[PDB]
Amino acid sequence: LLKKTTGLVGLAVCETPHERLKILYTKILDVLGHIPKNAAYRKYTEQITNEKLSIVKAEPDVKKLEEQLQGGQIEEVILQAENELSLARKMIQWKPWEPLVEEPPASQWKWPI
Amino acid sequence: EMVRKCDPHIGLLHRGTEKLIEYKTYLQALPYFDRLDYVSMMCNEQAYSLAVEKLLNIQPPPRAQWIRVLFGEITRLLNHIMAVTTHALDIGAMTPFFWMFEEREKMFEFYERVSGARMHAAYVRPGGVHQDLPLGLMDDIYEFSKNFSLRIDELEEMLTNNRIWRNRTVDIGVVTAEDALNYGFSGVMLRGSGIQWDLRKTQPYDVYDQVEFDVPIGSRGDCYDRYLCRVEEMRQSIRIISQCLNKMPPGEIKVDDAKVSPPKRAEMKTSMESLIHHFKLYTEGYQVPPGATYTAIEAPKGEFGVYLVSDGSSRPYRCKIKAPGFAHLAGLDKMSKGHMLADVVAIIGTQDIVFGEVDR
Amino acid sequence: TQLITVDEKLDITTLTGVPEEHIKTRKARIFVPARNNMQSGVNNTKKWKMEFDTRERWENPLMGWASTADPLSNLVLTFSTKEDAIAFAEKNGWSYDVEERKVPKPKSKSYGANFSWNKRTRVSTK
Amino acid sequence: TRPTVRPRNDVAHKQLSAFGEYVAEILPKYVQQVQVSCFSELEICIHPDGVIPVLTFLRDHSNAQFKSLADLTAVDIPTRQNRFEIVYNLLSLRFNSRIRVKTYTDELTPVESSVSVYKAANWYEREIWDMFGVFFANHPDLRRILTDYGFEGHPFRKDFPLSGYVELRYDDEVKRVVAEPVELAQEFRKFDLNSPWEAFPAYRQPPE
Amino acid sequence: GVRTSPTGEKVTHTGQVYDDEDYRRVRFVGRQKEVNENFAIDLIAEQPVSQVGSRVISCDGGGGALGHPRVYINLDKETKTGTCGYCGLQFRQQH
Amino acid sequence: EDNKQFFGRHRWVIYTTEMNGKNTFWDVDGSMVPPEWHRWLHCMTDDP
Amino acid sequence: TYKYVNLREPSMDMKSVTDRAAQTLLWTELIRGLGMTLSYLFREPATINYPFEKGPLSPRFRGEHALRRYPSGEERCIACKLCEAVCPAQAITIEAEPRADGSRRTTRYDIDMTKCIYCGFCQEACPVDAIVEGPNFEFSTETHEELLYNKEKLLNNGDKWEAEIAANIQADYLYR
Amino acid sequence: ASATRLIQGLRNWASGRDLQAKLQLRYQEISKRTQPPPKLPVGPSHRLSNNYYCARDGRREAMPPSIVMSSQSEKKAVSPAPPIKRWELSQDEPYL
Amino acid sequence: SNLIEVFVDGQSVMVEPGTTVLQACEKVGMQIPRFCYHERLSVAGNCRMCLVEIEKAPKVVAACAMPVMKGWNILTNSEKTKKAREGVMEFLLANHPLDCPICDQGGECDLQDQSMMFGSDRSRFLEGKRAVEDKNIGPLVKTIMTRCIQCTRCIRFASEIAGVDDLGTTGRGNDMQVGTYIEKMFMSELSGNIIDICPVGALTSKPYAFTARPWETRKTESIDVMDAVGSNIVVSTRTGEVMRILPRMHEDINEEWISDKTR
Amino acid sequence: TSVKPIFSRDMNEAKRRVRELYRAWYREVPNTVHLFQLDISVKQGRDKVREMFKKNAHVTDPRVVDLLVIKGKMELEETINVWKQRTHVMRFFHETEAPRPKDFLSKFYVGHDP
């Protein structure tokens, strides 16, 4: 319908939101495949990204996709997809599915002292 | 003419407030909060009161909650008069300063009628409010509110459509939405940039879910939309004050737990338990169960938060005070890039900066 | 590697901003404070406390107020164990003395002992 | 317990406990504890090597989106060997929620600066340098922010006295504002206010 | 009942007066030592002893909730009156 | 009094020209008001 | 539950375009501003004639401190030190002893009026209404130590202002 | 209020607003400075029976925080709450 | 060993036979409220503040006096325990005088503190209170017997430790008065220690009277030098002036007493 | 005893940073005496710099001297940029303070301090 403005300053209108979300979701899944399968981050992120990709594939209309993606404007859904992609590319390098690097001391989180 | 870098040096009013709080009890550390945002006194009282009442696992009575919302919106009128009139006085519009400080003077008379001080009331306390509204106060609040929209109208007649006020504020200090969220902005600084966020709607406190009001949202992120947001928040504060005057319930004003709030002075001079409780609350103070809260309210400058840590004693172990002006004056350097030197006074004006809460 | 090895004694006296007079002339006292014998509650005997030696308090010539020049005259620190307080004193270069925790030894209480047949532990009245 | 007692929010307690399990199992490399207060505030106590990987997670993850850093805090607790307790308060505007990320350091171990995640932290942790003395590595402009320019010591440390060690006055001999060791005409009177009777039996610690 | 030292200085209701050789009288040189000439110890002595026919009397200082906490005084001693601890009004059993 | 003046103007004091030995013809002082008139003039009550 | 400030797309018909251009060339909003300033020129100003006219206060007003007396001349302070335990500024210094008739009375009752934050916790903590924070606010001094009140100055403020203080407490005490 | 009708009409013309209906100076419409004495109500715990403090003890119902994880299947990914509902535009005055 | 297993709120503790309920709860770090129990006096059992629920038992027991039986689960925080504490604190504050500001025990009173902790926050007492005639038992112990809660630590101290046998209860009922019954001057060498163990301001220190107040006093832990016993003391001061001398507990010297010369 | 460093791996890199900070202070002292128009000589200020560096000379921990170098760079940054005034620079010279008693006998005469 060519929404005139997103309402948020600095967040421009996306002309083709559906194909953009599909490309970002498949790129998230392609990056996320390099994480081991036992990691909970991969399981949870694949689950929510498959839900979002099926909702994007299931709706031609932009505003109905905004009401059932449940994330506000469609452009901030795209922005969140970009943030999730950058996050997953950092999670590959950090490897945080590893065991705890160091136990805290014996009364480290004891409150009150 | 341009500004390449702005380095604000602060601490010129650092008094070490939140170290002094550590050596005083909760009632004794309450009047430190009147002096942080010293144009928003009862709102900071309300934020500290809600922090302590969250840690105490008690709640105010309904009439105290309506008094806190009524005086929080009177406080919001005070603060946005201060904001708009000093932001206009620094640019050069010096006349609505004098026009609106008579209205601000009458609201300080409201504070003095209800507490005895004009600014630092120590009126909103953990447990409720200190004292009940004297007779004829709400009638005069109604007589103020009946006239105050015309004062806002003639303010808005002097500034809003003026081309000189627009030229000093329309292209000035544009904040994007993502950089407003990333710099920790809050209140009008978010809402001028399009971000639909208000703590009285989303994470509501005392009876703000029972008042009906609107949230002004800007569209360009500049000084002018933040000006229009503050003026419309004065409008909506008049709306909430009308709803508070019409829906004020009868009843008590302190919590009826006399191990938290002190008893009435007639029964302290009659009952043994009331005299013991009066003694122990005004000398030791109530003990607070151990824990760390971060209770944030929507002060008229933004999210005012208290990270209060209680060790189980009658004094705070730690009390970190989050001010909106701290993050706003941190973001001053990005908000002033590419602007002129006379734009910087407009940008320091449009961030409603009060250095008591900036410095503590 | 990303970890260095420091086998020196932990000392931070150059970083705390404390002047020399209030490091090397003060005697920290690490102690469990005694129960006030005005009261029977024992919640103030639960933690260790670090205080310092008292310095001179004199009379204000104008009002008679207690004038001091000791910045550490109100500094009382709370510690859960003795060894935490000893480590905090040694870390700051405070020479300290430690008093051991004096718990009350357990008593032998018998209400019937108040009414014995042949022992001196009878109560003469009740 | 209706009129004077705060009502318990069990729905938010269950939701925050579930999301705390979620964060603890996505990031087991750094998460040390997860707890939820009785007034329903979630605390994620992490290891200080994972300041950046946890905070970048909560800021960027689609089930978290903690896009706002509300507050950043240190707490001096001298009875711990890691006496400083760095407290992050985060706000998700998307899910209308708040989380608390807690970690620890002593005087000498640096914490990684979180300006790469929240630029809002640029002053806050700088204040943590000024008030507590915690150093933040890879900070843009780390210096004092609130104390005077020649100020020795970190004031919100609990071994630092209430009044300082120095005080200022104008001296007309040298025509200058000067610093001298602090003498108070009236000493701050210390009040031992704590009752010797136990106030809260739920918070009782077991004896030795 | 204010009195006067040999230095000419007025003695307060505490009993405070500086010594002659104390330098701190120089603060009143050219000025005045503000004392209050209504000594409460003399003004409560002016009040008469209330003869009551009860054994235990209650005092709140008058005014209800504008006086002091209400206390109960025993009047079984006949040598001594029953003095209120707050207001100093002393009572006597009339029998 | 003048109750047709607005609230703040409606009560005032013309100070005496001599109080406690001091000529106050030009040196009027706000603390010249005795405490019984200080309630009425500051409008703590309606009653003189 | 929200509204959009400044989201008006202006009209582009020749009527509104010529209206905005006449506003630009003939300065309509500037004459509106001159009209509002001219409107306040002919209003009666809000200026009270101080010192002859006084700003309105309430009986709760928290000004200068005063130690009170019972209606017999006996002072109300029974030396209990609640006002200095509650004092957020530690402005109150109290020392006591039994006087010559055995009454629990103070010998030192100091208030530093330059530490005091004038918040009135002392008068609301006082069990016997001894310390009050009266209605005097015009007590500026020329020297710092004249704002360091002892018991004599505070009892003189009580004797000076009792005729007003008792009436203010009489007007307010059913809210306390 | 004491303005003559020529200056009053000039002032209302210059402001563009009927100023006399809403005067910013206060007159006899305001409350009396002397009020009757109140009778303030008591709270809900001012009862002589069924008023044991252990049934209304708020501070002693505060518990220590529930430790959810401590270092001594196909479950759904969760969020800290349901997502925020989109705000409705004002029916009163949307500026639209 | 012959230690028996009891439970305090579920938590097990192994106790010697003859251990009371109060000592068994002490061994896990809970202090049962008390007014007449003193660990160096004999067990009186007559203030009833230590009433506590043993589960599977429909009656509160006097924890200072009741020995534990094997397998008891002591419910120190249950509903009827707290109802018993509030009822007993209500009866203690029935006839107790509103003297807390003019009292030397304010801020260091057991009755204030465990009224804040274990009692109700208001009065149902709508009657007039009793007033008890004061006594003159010497120049050291100021006597205000209206404040007396009749706990008989007077009598147990003067009998068992002081060895005097001259304080006792006359009268009967609500008219029961602790005193000497005659104009008698209680001047033992340990006569000031009844100022310590009196939980209320009925027995106060006549030299210390009205001069100070406990929260503003700094506590300096020091040694007696008035004899060669070496009694541990607290010199409590206020603004650079010595206010009074209290005892410290030392189990091997002075158990928690000091002499009148020291005091 | 395996701790995370600040900048230096051992004491040699630490002494290198101490030495470069000393070079920066030594170069800066004449500029500081000029633009704050201090009434001390350049040699007097350089002796004060040598005194402030010899005061911390007893430290063998690399993290502690790294923090001393960091705080010295902060003081230097407050000096070069005119953020200190003349008063903050002259607070290193305790000039209004009377000289303290050093031996036993004068400390006995003045008071109770050890």
Ligand code: SF4
């Ligand atoms: S003024 Fe009141 S609170 Fe203060 S010591 Fe005197 S009686 Fe107590």
Ligand code: SF4
């Ligand atoms: S008004 Fe407040 S600060 Fe002033 S003396 Fe009273 S309690 Fe202290």
Ligand code: SF4
């Ligand atoms: S003995 Fe205790 S409860 Fe009784 S008056 Fe004294 S302080 Fe109050």
Ligand code: SF4
């Ligand atoms: S005077 Fe004190 S110790 Fe003696 S019986 Fe009474 S309350 Fe107990």
Ligand code: FES
């Ligand atoms: S303590 Fe057991 S009854 Fe007094």
Ligand SMILES: [K+]
């Ligand atoms: K006693």
Ligand SMILES: [Zn+2]
């Ligand atoms: Zn009386």
